[PDB]
Amino acid sequence: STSVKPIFSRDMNEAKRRVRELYRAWYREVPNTVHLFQLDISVKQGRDKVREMFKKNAHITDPRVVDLLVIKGKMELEETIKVWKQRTHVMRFFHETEAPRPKDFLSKFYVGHDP
Amino acid sequence: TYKYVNLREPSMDMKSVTDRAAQTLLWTELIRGLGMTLSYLFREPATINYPFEKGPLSPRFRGEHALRRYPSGEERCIACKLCEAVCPAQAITIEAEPRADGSRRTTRYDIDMTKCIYCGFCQEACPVDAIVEGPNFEFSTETHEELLYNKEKLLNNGDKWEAEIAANIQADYLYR
Amino acid sequence: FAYDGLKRQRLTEPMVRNEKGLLTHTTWEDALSRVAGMLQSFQGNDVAAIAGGLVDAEALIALKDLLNRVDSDTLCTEEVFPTAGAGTDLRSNYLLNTTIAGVEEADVVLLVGTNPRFEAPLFNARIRKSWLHNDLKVALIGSPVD
Amino acid sequence: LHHAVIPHGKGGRSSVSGIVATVFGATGFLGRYVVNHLGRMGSQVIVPHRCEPYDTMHLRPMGDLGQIIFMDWNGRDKDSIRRAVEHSSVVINLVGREWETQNFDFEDVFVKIPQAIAQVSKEAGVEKFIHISHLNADIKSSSKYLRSKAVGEKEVRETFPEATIIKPAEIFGREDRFLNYFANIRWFGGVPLISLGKKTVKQPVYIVDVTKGIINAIKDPDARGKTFAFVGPSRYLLFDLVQYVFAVAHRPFLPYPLPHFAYRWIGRLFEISPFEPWTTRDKVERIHTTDKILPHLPGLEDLGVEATPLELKAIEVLRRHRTYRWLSSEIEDVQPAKTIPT
Amino acid sequence: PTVKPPTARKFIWTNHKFNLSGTPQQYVPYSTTRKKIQEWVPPSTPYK
Amino acid sequence: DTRPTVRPRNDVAHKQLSAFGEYVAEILPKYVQQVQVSCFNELEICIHPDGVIPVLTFLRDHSNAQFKSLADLTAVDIPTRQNRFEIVYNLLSLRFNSRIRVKTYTDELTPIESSVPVYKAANWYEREIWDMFGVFFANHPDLRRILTDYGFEGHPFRKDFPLSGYVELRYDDEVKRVVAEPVELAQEFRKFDLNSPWEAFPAYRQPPE
Amino acid sequence: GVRTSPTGEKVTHTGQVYDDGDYRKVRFVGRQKEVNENFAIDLIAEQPVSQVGSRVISCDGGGGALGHPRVYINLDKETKTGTCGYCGLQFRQQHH
Amino acid sequence: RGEYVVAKLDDLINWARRSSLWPMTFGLACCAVEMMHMAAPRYDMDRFGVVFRASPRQSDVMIVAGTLTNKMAPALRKVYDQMPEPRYVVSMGSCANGGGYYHYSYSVVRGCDRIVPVDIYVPGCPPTAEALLYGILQLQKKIKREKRLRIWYRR
Numbered sequence A: 001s002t003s004v005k006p007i008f009s010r011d012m013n014e015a016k017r018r019v020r021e022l023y024r025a026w027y028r029e030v031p032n033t034v035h036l037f038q039l040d041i042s043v044k045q046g047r048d049k050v051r052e053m054f055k056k057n058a059h060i061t062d063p064r065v066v067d068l069l070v071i072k073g074k075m076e077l078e079e080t081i082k083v084w085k086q087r088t089h090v091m092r093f094f095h096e097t098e099a100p101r102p103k104d105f106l107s108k109f110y111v112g113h114d115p
Numbered sequence B: 001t002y003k004y005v006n007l008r009e010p011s012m013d014m015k016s017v018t019d020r021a022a023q024t025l026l027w028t029e030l031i032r033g034l035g036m037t038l039s040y041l042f043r044e045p046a047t048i049n050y051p052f053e054k055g056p057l058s059p060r061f062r063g064e065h066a067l068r069r070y071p072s073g074e075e076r077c078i079a080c081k082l083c084e085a086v087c088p089a090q091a092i093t094i095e096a097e098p099r100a101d102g103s104r105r106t107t108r109y110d111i112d113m114t115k116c117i118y119c120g121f122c123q124e125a126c127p128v129d130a131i132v133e134g135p136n137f138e139f140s141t142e143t144h145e146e147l148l149y150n151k152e153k154l155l156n157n158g159d160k161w162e163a164e165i166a167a168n169i170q171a172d173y174l175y176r
Numbered sequence C: 001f002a003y004d005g006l007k008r009q010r011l012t013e014p015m016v017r018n019e020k021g022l023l024t025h026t027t028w029e030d031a032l033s034r035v036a037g038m039l040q041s042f043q044g045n046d047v048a049a050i051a052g053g054l055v056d057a058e059a060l061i062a063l064k065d066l067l068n069r070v071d072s073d074t075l076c077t078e079e080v081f082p083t084a085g086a087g088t089d090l091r092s093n094y095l096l097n098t099t100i101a102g103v104e105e106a107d108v109v110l111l112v113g114t115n116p117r118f119e120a121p122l123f124n125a126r127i128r129k130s131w132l133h134n135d136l137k138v139a140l141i142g143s144p145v146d
Numbered sequence D: 001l002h003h004a005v006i007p008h009g010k011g012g013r014s015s016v017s018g019i020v021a022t023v024f025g026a027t028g029f030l031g032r033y034v035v036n037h038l039g040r041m042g043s044q045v046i047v048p049h050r051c052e053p054y055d056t057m058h059l060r061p062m063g064d065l066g067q068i069i070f071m072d073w074n075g076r077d078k079d080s081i082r083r084a085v086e087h088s089s090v091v092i093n094l095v096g097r098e099w100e101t102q103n104f105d106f107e108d109v110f111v112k113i114p115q116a117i118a119q120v121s122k123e124a125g126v127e128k129f130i131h132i133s134h135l136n137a138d139i140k141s142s143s144k145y146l147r148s149k150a151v152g153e154k155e156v157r158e159t160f161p162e163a164t165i166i167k168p169a170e171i172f173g174r175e176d177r178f179l180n181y182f183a184n185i186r187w188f189g190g191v192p193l194i195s196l197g198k199k200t201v202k203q204p205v206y207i208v209d210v211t212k213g214i215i216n217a218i219k220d221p222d223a224r225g226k227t228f229a230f231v232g233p234s235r236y237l238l239f240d241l242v243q244y245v246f247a248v249a250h251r252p253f254l255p256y257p258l259p260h261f262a263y264r265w266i267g268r269l270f271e272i273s274p275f276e277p278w279t280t281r282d283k284v285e286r287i288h289t290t291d292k293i294l295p296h297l298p299g300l301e302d303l304g305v306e307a308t309p310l311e312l313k314a315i316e317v318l319r320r321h322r323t324y325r326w327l328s329s330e331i332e333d334v335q336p337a338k339t340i341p342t
Numbered sequence E: 001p002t003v004k005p006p007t008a009r010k011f012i013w014t015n016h017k018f019n020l021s022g023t024p025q026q027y028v029p030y031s032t033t034r035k036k037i038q039e040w041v042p043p044s045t046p047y048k
Numbered sequence F: 001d002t003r004p005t006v007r008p009r010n011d012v013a014h015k016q017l018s019a020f021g022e023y024v025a026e027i028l029p030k031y032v033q034q035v036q037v038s039c040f041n042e043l044e045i046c047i048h049p050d051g052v053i054p055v056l057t058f059l060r061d062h063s064n065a066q067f068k069s070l071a072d073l074t075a076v077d078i079p080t081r082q083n084r085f086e087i088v089y090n091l092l093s094l095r096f097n098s099r100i101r102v103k104t105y106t107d108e109l110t111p112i113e114s115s116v117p118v119y120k121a122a123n124w125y126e127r128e129i130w131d132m133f134g135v136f137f138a139n140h141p142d143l144r145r146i147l148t149d150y151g152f153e154g155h156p157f158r159k160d161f162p163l164s165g166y167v168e169l170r171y172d173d174e175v176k177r178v179v180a181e182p183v184e185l186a187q188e189f190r191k192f193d194l195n196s197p198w199e200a201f202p203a204y205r206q207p208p209e
Numbered sequence G: 001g002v003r004t005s006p007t008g009e010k011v012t013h014t015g016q017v018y019d020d021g022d023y024r025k026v027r028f029v030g031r032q033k034e035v036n037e038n039f040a041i042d043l044i045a046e047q048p049v050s051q052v053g054s055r056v057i058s059c060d061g062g063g064g065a066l067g068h069p070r071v072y073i074n075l076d077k078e079t080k081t082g083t084c085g086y087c088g089l090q091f092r093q094q095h096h
Numbered sequence H: 001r002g003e004y005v006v007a008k009l010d011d012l013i014n015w016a017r018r019s020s021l022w023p024m025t026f027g028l029a030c031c032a033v034e035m036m037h038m039a040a041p042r043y044d045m046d047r048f049g050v051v052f053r054a055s056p057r058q059s060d061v062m063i064v065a066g067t068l069t070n071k072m073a074p075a076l077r078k079v080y081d082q083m084p085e086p087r088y089v090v091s092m093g094s095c096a097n098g099g100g101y102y103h104y105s106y107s108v109v110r111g112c113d114r115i116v117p118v119d120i121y122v123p124g125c126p127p128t129a130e131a132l133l134y135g136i137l138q139l140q141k142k143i144k145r146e147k148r149l150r151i152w153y154r155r
């Protein structure tokens, strides 16, 4: 039952190799992206954001899911490197317009009914 | 059955070869095309002098929406909400309550004309010929809000366009 | 048909008393602050609560905890139930233990001091069902009602 | 609260915030940012405008349907003001010219008109009045712009005692007339400065910070009746600030000292323009007026805002003053300006 | 219409109106329904 | 066939297509799981997802088939099934004037083998499936989004994706660019419950549970 | 008929009017509130009751297929007038 | 009197702009065919002085004729920003006016007025060539009422 067709990785050790390789490519590419897209952020800010995205999923332990996340990341790399994206797409990771939303009970209580 | 569009071979006699050479050197076929454009120049143009002349239309034309009345002046709509249900665009919003005389009538009848596709399904569905796509097509606005129609707007359009609307229905109700 | 009363005489905004002594609209911040100040000041039996008929269990326990943390156990209802003997210690003392569905299997029913037609319209309808299909016998110790 | 002004939603475009605002002088540098933040959270904004409607088109996309309403008004018609504030909970005054037209003076735009809006706003029962003055407004200043600001600041406070009065420093942004003013001086060769700009200290503030603080003053009960001072994180010497502007713009910087009397006469020569003057004798004095340090007044940190450094938002303003060679140079290529420590 | 005239109803407009967009006579949308939830009006007397 | 309103039946095709289904099942037992022919005469072959290339190549190249054209390749989301995604191949044979449907299955994480080696038309169809449903086709020349916006996160055609999505776009003058924000609708989509409580088609009545 | 509120706003045939303290009446400043002056409740009442000689009468609204679905109205109660559920027309049975 | 001069000069500059409206060759979907039909012999937008030019730099009017998706939206703002001023936008069809029949889609901007300012809204799906022409002529009248120089004199 648990026997399942793999995507690329046969174990988490082989998958975590692809995660690290992907982080390398992203880390090289932020300096060019800031220059090419003419963004008003720093290279450190972009490299921090890459770290944040890689940290969000820091809990997964399924080799197949990690492969898909790596596949999706690599696609976003082809888009950004080849300038298929635009300045609006690259800057959507930073959520500049979204004013900070309350994250404490009292603040949520004063504004609305949401959990 | 089928036919070949370009599977003809040329004639290699000298007269034919010479004729093609003349076509190549004296541009006969190109000159031929210039004649057609010259003929069109001396034809009457197909242009109409809008807005003093209008393009032809039919009684079935689907245009600006209107809410109609019986000859008494009573609203035909009974709030059945069939138009709301069939609208492919969810452009119609209806709320109803019993009127002071006990009649089933609407308190809200809103059509978002920027959601409408002008399909006429709502005038097909109506069982009392209350909602109609009228003849008018010249209701462009300077703002979006002016195209969010409420009940009063749709009733004024009916009272504005009733004479034309009724006559068109008289012409096409036998096909419907 | 009582759902239409939920659209009338509703409380929509927090209210506090002004200098004149009249309730005026305010904000959650102000109203909760006025309430919390007295809760800190008073303690023990000086703090009490009364629960109404349409109160949820989540709020009931919540209020209990808040008043317990000021060492107040005066958590009260509006509906009396004898506190003598085992009072509320045992559930069986204050529950319809036979269940609503049990009336169908009963042979005799004795009703004391209650009009089940109006206090529990759907429970009386269950009694009449057994009265009709299982030939139940019903007795009453109270005012003669229909 | 009337049932219509009770907040609903998650603070988006289609939400309701309970703020029905009349913003005078909304067609300018500060207003377009104020209206945008107002319309982000679902507020009803009345935009009374004097100008051609074509010049208000950039505001229409800032709010959902019906949430931006446009009215015509005249600063000399007290009734036109009344129609615009009678249904509003907060009124914001952003009216001002950096020059004196034939019809309107500095007195008209900083004293007479603001008092009229305040007088009418109170008669119509407006809860809140937010007035923008200047950090360096003073009765004894050389600049008439700043002296008239002080007069209006006092008239507003006497007419509308609960009015929140906000006193910004020089504001820098894409449409500022501060960093762009300096960068366009390249047209005239070098940069004329008084005493070479070693005696003037500036504390410029980002436009968004001002916009956030104004908005938070609307939503803060405490702000009522107070006077705020919106200043930037750091203080700079005019010479160093001007030099930083040119470095970011990658344009040659040729500072030369120009005495006080001369750079006054150049202003009078640029004031003859029937259109918008490139510079004026007043703007001269203001650029070279050292920004006051007002510790007795509350600041942005009291309204919840965090001051934005010039070093992070200068490039967005000054990259349009670059040539193709230097357009792509990044934000880390220009070493930041020297700062006067506190 | 000079030959075959339209039918006459009382409710039909006697005076036609050209497009009124951009003018003071323009149509402004609004909701035609009354309020849903009534709200408790507090007593006008000072209790205690 | 004299009933004016009822679709005529063609039994000759039903017998022909049924036999060809037996023909395929006999030749490809290793992968074929089910063969069915419909009332309106269409043959469906249902296969294990590991026989996509073998089965498609046989149908394309066998002399008693010659399905040289891939008319369409799509997917269907059925959440209740543990393998929620049904991959459907519709093929056309010009030689025999016939159509055949091939069906297989997969889940969110299990890849399917790309059919590009068999039909070069499948390149874009497979990209659309990935973009819209999130199914990964292994050994594809270039698998990337084709219909969704750049950076779009999610697979819209899954039955669990909201119709109006999670984000919406607008232009913000402050940042002078188009920005994405969470979706808020002035008028919520009105869900109409149209199904009737009374059964309509007895012949499809599902056996009681 | 159109009656005006103390503020001056016109009331609609649905009874809608903005109360004094509602901000939403600012949308009508410099523009107008569009209200149809022909109130259908008033116009139907003007139509005379029809005297008929049967316990049951039919109504199609007039025009045949251009009216409303045909219905039959009972006129056996002499304390009221039979009314159509579609067109609002009233009928009464004439004492034989 | 200078109020007379600005008024006549204002008339001239308005007359030229409304008498030489050059739309950008820009369409998105099935409202564009009806725009072609406004360019065709029967209606001949050219006779009014309306000439289609591809480049945004040589354009005065953007007619948004079709459904604006989210992928497309950044491009529409770009070409709009690249149009020299004065510039006007006509919204043609339900899809552009408010999303129309894809209004509830994840991939559709619920109106082009979220992306760019709009001067005229033409309702329909599709609007007829005659109805678009009514909108163009309505834009011409809007320009005729502009008071840019009269306002400048009183500024």
Ligand SMILES: CCCCCCCCCCCCCCCCCC(=O)OC[C@H](COP(=O)([O-])OCC[N+](C)(C)C)OC(=O)CCCCCCCCCCCCCCCCC
Binding pocket: B024, B025, B026, B027, B030, B031
């Ligand atoms: C008699 C004593 C001795 C003296 C003898 C003097 C020589 C006389 C005989 C020479 C014949 C020369 C024929 C003319 C030149 C041939 C040009 C040619 O090479 O054509 C081949 C070319 C090529 O035709 P092609 O299709 O065959 O191209 C392929 C060529 N092969 C196959 C050989 C590789 O034709 C064209 O030039 C087409 C031009 C297209 C543009 C046409 C625009 C419309 C113009 C219409 C108006 C023309 C009238 C203008 C009048 C101006 C008035 C001021």
Ligand SMILES: NC(=O)C1=CN([C@@H]2O[C@H](COP(=O)(O)OP(=O)(O)OC[C@H]3O[C@@H](n4cnc5c(N)ncnc54)[C@H](OP(=O)(O)O)[C@@H]3O)[C@@H](O)[C@H]2O)C=CC1
Binding pocket: D024, D025, D026, D027, D028, D029, D030, D031, D049, D050, D051, D075, D093, D094, D095, D096, D097, D098, D104, D109, D132, D133, D134, D135, D167, D168, D169, D170, D171, D172, D176, D178
């Ligand atoms: N660095 C800065 O920019 C600082 C600004 N302030 C104050 O902030 C406020 C706005 O700043 P800013 O927005 O940059 O000023 P802008 O000049 O950018 O826009 C100001 C507004 O005032 C309006 N206005 C000016 N005069 C009149 C008048 N006579 N009648 C009607 N409306 C008028 C204009 O409308 P129109 O264009 O239609 O005339 C314009 O929209 C001003 O009061 C300014 O003094 C304070 C400190 C610093």
Ligand code: SF4
Binding pocket: B083, B086, B087, B088, B089, B090, B091, B092, B111, B115, B116, B117, B118, B119, B120, B121, B122, B123, B133
């Ligand atoms: S015409 Fe079609 S889309 Fe428009 S309101 Fe009627 S049913 Fe809806």
Ligand code: SF4
Binding pocket: B076, B077, B078, B079, B080, B081, B082, B083, B084, B094, B122, B125, B126, B127, B128, B129, B130, B131
């Ligand atoms: S279908 Fe006709 S009668 Fe029914 S609600 Fe719609 S308009 Fe009214």
Ligand code: SF4
Binding pocket: H029, H030, H031, H032, H065, H066, H067, H092, H093, H094, H095, H096, H100, H101, H124, H125, H126, H127
């Ligand atoms: S508005 Fe109508 S014509 Fe235009 S793209 Fe949408 S459906 Fe097609």
Ligand SMILES: [Zn+2]
Binding pocket: G059, G060, G061, G068, G084, G085, G086, G087, G088, G089
């Ligand atoms: Zn009837």
